[PDB]
Amino acid sequence: SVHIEAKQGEIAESILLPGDPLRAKYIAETFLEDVTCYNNVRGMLGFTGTYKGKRVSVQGTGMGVPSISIYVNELIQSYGVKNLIRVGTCGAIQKDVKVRDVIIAMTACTDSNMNRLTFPGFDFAPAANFDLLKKAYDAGTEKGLHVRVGNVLTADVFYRESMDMVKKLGDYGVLAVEMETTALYTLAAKYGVNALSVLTVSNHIFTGEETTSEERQTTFNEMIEIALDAAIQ
Amino acid sequence: SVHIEAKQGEIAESILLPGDPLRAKYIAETFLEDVTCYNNVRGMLGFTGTYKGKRVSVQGTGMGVPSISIYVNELIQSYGVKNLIRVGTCGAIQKDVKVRDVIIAMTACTDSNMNRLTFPGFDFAPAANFDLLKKAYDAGTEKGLHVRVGNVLTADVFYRESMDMVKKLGDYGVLAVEMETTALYTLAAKYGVNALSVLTVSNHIFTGEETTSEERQTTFNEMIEIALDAAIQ
Amino acid sequence: SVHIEAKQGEIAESILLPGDPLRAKYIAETFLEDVTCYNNVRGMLGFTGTYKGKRVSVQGTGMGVPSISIYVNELIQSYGVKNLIRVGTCGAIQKDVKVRDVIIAMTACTDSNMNRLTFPGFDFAPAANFDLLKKAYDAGTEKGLHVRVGNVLTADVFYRESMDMVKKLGDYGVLAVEMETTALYTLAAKYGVNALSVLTVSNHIFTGEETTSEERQTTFNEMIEIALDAAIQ
Amino acid sequence: SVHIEAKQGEIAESILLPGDPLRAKYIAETFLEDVTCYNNVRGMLGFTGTYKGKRVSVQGTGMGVPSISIYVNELIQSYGVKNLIRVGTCGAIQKDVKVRDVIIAMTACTDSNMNRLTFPGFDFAPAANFDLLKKAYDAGTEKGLHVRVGNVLTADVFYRESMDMVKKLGDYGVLAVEMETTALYTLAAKYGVNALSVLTVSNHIFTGEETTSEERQTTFNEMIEIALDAAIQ
Amino acid sequence: SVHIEAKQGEIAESILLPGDPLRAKYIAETFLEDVTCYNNVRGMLGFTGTYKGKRVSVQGTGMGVPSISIYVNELIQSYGVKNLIRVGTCGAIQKDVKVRDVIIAMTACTDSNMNRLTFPGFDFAPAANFDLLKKAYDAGTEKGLHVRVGNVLTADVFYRESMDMVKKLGDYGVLAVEMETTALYTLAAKYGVNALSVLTVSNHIFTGEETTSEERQTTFNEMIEIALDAAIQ
Amino acid sequence: SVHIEAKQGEIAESILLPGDPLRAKYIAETFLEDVTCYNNVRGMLGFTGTYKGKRVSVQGTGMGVPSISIYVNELIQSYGVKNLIRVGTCGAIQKDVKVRDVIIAMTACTDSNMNRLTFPGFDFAPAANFDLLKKAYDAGTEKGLHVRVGNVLTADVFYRESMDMVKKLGDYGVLAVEMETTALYTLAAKYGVNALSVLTVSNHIFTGEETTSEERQTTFNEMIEIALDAAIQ
Numbered sequence A, B, C, D, E, F: 001s002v003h004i005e006a007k008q009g010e011i012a013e014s015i016l017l018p019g020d021p022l023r024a025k026y027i028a029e030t031f032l033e034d035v036t037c038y039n040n041v042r043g044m045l046g047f048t049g050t051y052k053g054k055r056v057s058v059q060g061t062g063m064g065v066p067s068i069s070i071y072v073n074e075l076i077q078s079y080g081v082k083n084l085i086r087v088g089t090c091g092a093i094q095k096d097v098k099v100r101d102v103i104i105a106m107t108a109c110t111d112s113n114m115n116r117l118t119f120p121g122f123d124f125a126p127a128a129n130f131d132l133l134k135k136a137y138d139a140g141t142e143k144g145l146h147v148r149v150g151n152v153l154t155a156d157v158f159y160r161e162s163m164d165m166v167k168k169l170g171d172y173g174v175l176a177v178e179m180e181t182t183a184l185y186t187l188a189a190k191y192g193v194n195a196l197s198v199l200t201v202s203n204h205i206f207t208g209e210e211t212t213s214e215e216r217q218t219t220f221n222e223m224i225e226i227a228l229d230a231a232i233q
């Protein structure tokens, strides 16, 4: 496809979608066997391998609705991908959401215009695939993680001049901010395929708490395991 | 409160919210014991009784976002209600959704302006309480119903001049149309309480299939049972 | 029709539209002769009788744009209704508007999205039928009421978190808040029929003054008389 | 003021507002006595004189919401004007509205953003002063004119690429198109003063019928007479 | 055309567009030879003459997007005009922009709805013709003027209740406020012809500095010279 | 900063901003001397070196408004960058724009919501720094390139379901589509620094013409040279 140099058949039907291509590399090297790298266009690494005997892929998406939309469109339309699980990070809005919690997004709010252009006059609420959601929830519960299922904000702007509206969204139960889920869920629904976002809380937006990858590595690894485990079902 | 004549303490902390006040009466008479009627203002019947030994209420909401918003605000703010389950009907958009299916709304799309006014420039995605959702899903699965968990449209207009956008929403996975869920979910989130909508598909919007209450009574009764059963947990 | 169980011909061509179905009952019992009740679906009472020898009906609408839109569509399209007069209550915004004043709405502002969806990019100003307006104005003037003709707000939200915008509308001459007129006027114009809203001020939104039905009964009765009197012309 | 060179007191409290400054000149020369010209800034002629013994003024506004807004703000805020009657032309949308009809605008629709900026999320419906409206209606009825009271469109664009939305507005009862009324009515309401628009239909937008000033001069003169006659009351 | 009484061929292919028709007269009398006046409809003076031997015209536009849009549509579509240079005034927002500076607008921001109606969901950025822009810039630089090339605001409202957003636009580099450029640039682009706006700063919006025409006459004359000089190339 | 691991002082005040980090590497290796790599976070390569003796940097941005906004905010606010030139590719809309043309964006249209959120009710037109624009234009003209200066579309969606609006923008003179310029120009203006986008046309959106990097390498190299050459001035 335009942004992926893989041949037909090189990408598995189940795929994990980290934002960071170097996390795709980490995931492939850490969890998968019989790995190949099928893409390096724009440095946006993608790999296919095997996990507990089942083929699965992992593809960086970049940051933001427009970037992930490019990759998700191509994966679905050109490579026949059927199950897409974003595995990423997010920033907690609410005090009761803690760093290292795992959030499974039921739906996402957004300040993107992408859906207003498609459905003029409507608020489109992008929805996770429930069967994937339940599988991931059950796996995370069994794994011993703190798992929160709820609403997130998909933001276009990481650096917002005022966080007043983000605070207000927190007062309406929104758990955390990230930059991709609306697009993944909307496009998966458009094409009749299955999507989910499983997120590690890496920072808290108002307290200023932050982590390095190493400082959340054990939680992150466990989260990747549940995302894979849902995928292989 | 302005629209409910009940005394403090007369309304239980768990409440079912049919749109039709005569369905509130049917639910109270059919399922509850030790019933009183606490409201007849505007004919919008409300009752409190006991189900399997646990106090529970049932309150008509009327049709549309503005009507249900009035009742939900008053129930939460004046009567201390904590768990609110809308029990209603909806019209299927998709061919694969069948009359007599039970839909549990994860989230809702809308053509209402209510949330655009609150969050200018954002799409707010109203979310069910996951713990109530899971309880209802598990109960419905055990009860032997066809249960679908997904997205609905909360419409302001029942009689729409063109159904083009409703069809398009169906192509993006939206299951059915109804007229209340966005408001219930948004206000419950605002006030930190728990909400869910459990819906019976009573009509199919493009095929023209329709039912009378009697023609869906067994399914409807089973749906009320799961809504109660979730409530009493 | 879907929400009205009347046979063809049972509803008169002129109809009064209170929001409260119990007010429809009061109006029929108090003013009309040879009364029948043609609807009890959803408790939304409707009656037909005679006033000064002329057939006229009265139909509850419920609260909010979506509810009244359902009933008005059905009355016009399925029952051939030609003259529709909402008779309701409203909350004064301005200090110079007093409780027990009668407001005849020339037009209505709104926070509903209903007309933005129909006329994207435009502000649609819904207009009363002038000939009905003049008849009601002349009748109210003769009856000795305080009658104000002007602008109202049709609100989707009764419980608004901030009343700043309602205050601002008052500073631009808007007289009072209610929850139905935009829909009635827009749909009547769509179908080429005649509509008017005649409202009793029952509360003042910033002073906190409020009334019971009994406390405004004489004014309300006189208002119903002028609404009927316009109708029978 | 910035756009009017008159001294304080030179402009009367009642004023007619044609769009064309040369029509202001025609009105002053044809109907008024003891006339002075108080403004020629930008060629936007303004005059004060006497009609049936009462002082009255006439001020060109130019075309469009932004132009009339400048003049109306200055007249109200700097010159203390209290009664403002636009006297202009319009293009009929509906077949049943005829060239040479006089339309008295109750309210106006618009494609301008002026009120959306002031009342974000709301449709503001600008309203005529009813007492001026009634006076003009009664005077026009007595004068023997065809007078229509209703809704108009205040357009920003005279040359619209598609007239689809204008046709649709006609199907919702909107009588004619012009380019000033929303602004006049909104600003008069803002400042607590009295406004009305009295319009001659000079063209029909879909049939292509058009007139010269001479071809509508008798109707136009009679319309000016009723506008003055209302003003002097 | 509807608003211009000129015969075909009486208007030159290059035209200057002051907002004030009396400035059109001043420009024609001061700079042009062999002058005729081709329009006095609505007092909106237009002239054709010769400058350094080349035919050129000058046409008042009035104030605001809707007024200039009328004239620009007619000039382009009915009179075959190819090069259109607005020559006007503006109000500085930024402290670093000085009265008597000449601003050449690269593009324009707006609070008009004109382009949102044409391109729903998009921000359209109207662009100057670069070749005209460069010619005017080079001529102004040679003439010894202070020339600033940048962004302006095309406002619908001269009298804005709050200038907060205008200040904010200044903080994002917007140089000055005026009331026509968006329309000129958008329509010229639509029809494939060449437009530019060359503006004299006549007032500073926050400091209150203001000028009479006489107080900026030398700068204004030099600006007209560069606008002509670009035109005749 | 959060997404760049460079120490203070490691990034030069002038920077080129390709979307593709592998193009940043190509630019550094091909044109610069004394090169270091200061960032590999998320694979988003950044380098500093010397060109004709002057320090300059090159930093990948990723694709889309949200991605470039992250990097531009950090470069300006944390690293003190003053001159930012995006060097990228774009897709021609118009037939008269050819593959291998170089487009210098004066301004950009967008379907992003980023500026509507910042300036509610306004269309913000993001503007290039004119002095950088002129330098690049003069350098490209001297270099013998086909250089077009004009308007572009900054799109959020690469894969748009209908290209109707993109075609319409082409009919209003918009030259090409890309995915970053609105953000770069808006943020540079916000912070008072200098930005420009210099683009190679790599594909034609309606004809289907496309190129590989090798197939446009000579043009691309010349474009990089002019971007550098402007930068070092």
Ligand SMILES: Nc1ncnc2c1ncn2[C@@H]1O[C@H](CO)[C@@H](O)[C@H]1O
Binding pocket: A019, A062, A063, A064, A088, A089, A090, A091, A092, A155, A158, A177, A178, A179, A180, A202, A203, A205
């Ligand atoms: N506080 C935050 N705000 C926005 N995005 C965040 C935040 N924390 C983590 N992310 C995620 O990391 C990237 C931005 O650093 C995005 O891909 C986004 O999903």
Ligand SMILES: Nc1ncnc2c1ncn2[C@@H]1O[C@H](CO)[C@@H](O)[C@H]1O
Binding pocket: B019, B062, B063, B064, B088, B089, B090, B091, B092, B155, B158, B177, B178, B179, B180, B202, B203, B205
């Ligand atoms: N097809 C439908 N469209 C809209 N609302 C529906 C439909 N079917 C059932 N409903 C529900 O029933 C009422 C409208 O008849 C509303 O309360 C709504 O939730």
Ligand SMILES: Nc1ncnc2c1ncn2[C@@H]1O[C@H](CO)[C@@H](O)[C@H]1O
Binding pocket: C019, C062, C063, C064, C088, C089, C090, C091, C092, C155, C158, C177, C178, C179, C180, C202, C203, C205
């Ligand atoms: N203050 C108020 N705000 C909104 N609606 C009101 C108010 N007072 C009376 N109403 C009317 O009564 C109902 C809400 O109580 C609605 O039908 C509405 O028209």
Ligand SMILES: Nc1ncnc2c1ncn2[C@@H]1O[C@H](CO)[C@@H](O)[C@H]1O
Binding pocket: D019, D062, D063, D064, D088, D089, D090, D091, D092, D155, D158, D177, D178, D179, D180, D202, D203, D205
């Ligand atoms: N068909 C029309 N469309 C828009 N404005 C019109 C029309 N006919 C008359 N007008 C009026 O005349 C001017 C435009 O020619 C405006 O001031 C406007 O109010």
Ligand SMILES: Nc1ncnc2c1ncn2[C@@H]1O[C@H](CO)[C@@H](O)[C@H]1O
Binding pocket: E019, E062, E063, E064, E088, E089, E090, E091, E092, E155, E158, E177, E178, E179, E180, E202, E203, E205
């Ligand atoms: N401060 C200002 N605000 C708006 N328009 C201005 C200003 N100064 C000059 N103008 C120009 O002059 C007219 C308004 O006085 C308009 O045509 C406009 O372009």
Ligand SMILES: Nc1ncnc2c1ncn2[C@@H]1O[C@H](CO)[C@@H](O)[C@H]1O
Binding pocket: F019, F062, F063, F064, F088, F089, F090, F091, F092, F155, F158, F177, F178, F179, F180, F202, F203, F205
């Ligand atoms: N046809 C196109 N549509 C959108 N972006 C494009 C196109 N061609 C090149 N681009 C650029 O390349 C990337 C998308 O492939 C974006 O960074 C964008 O700026």
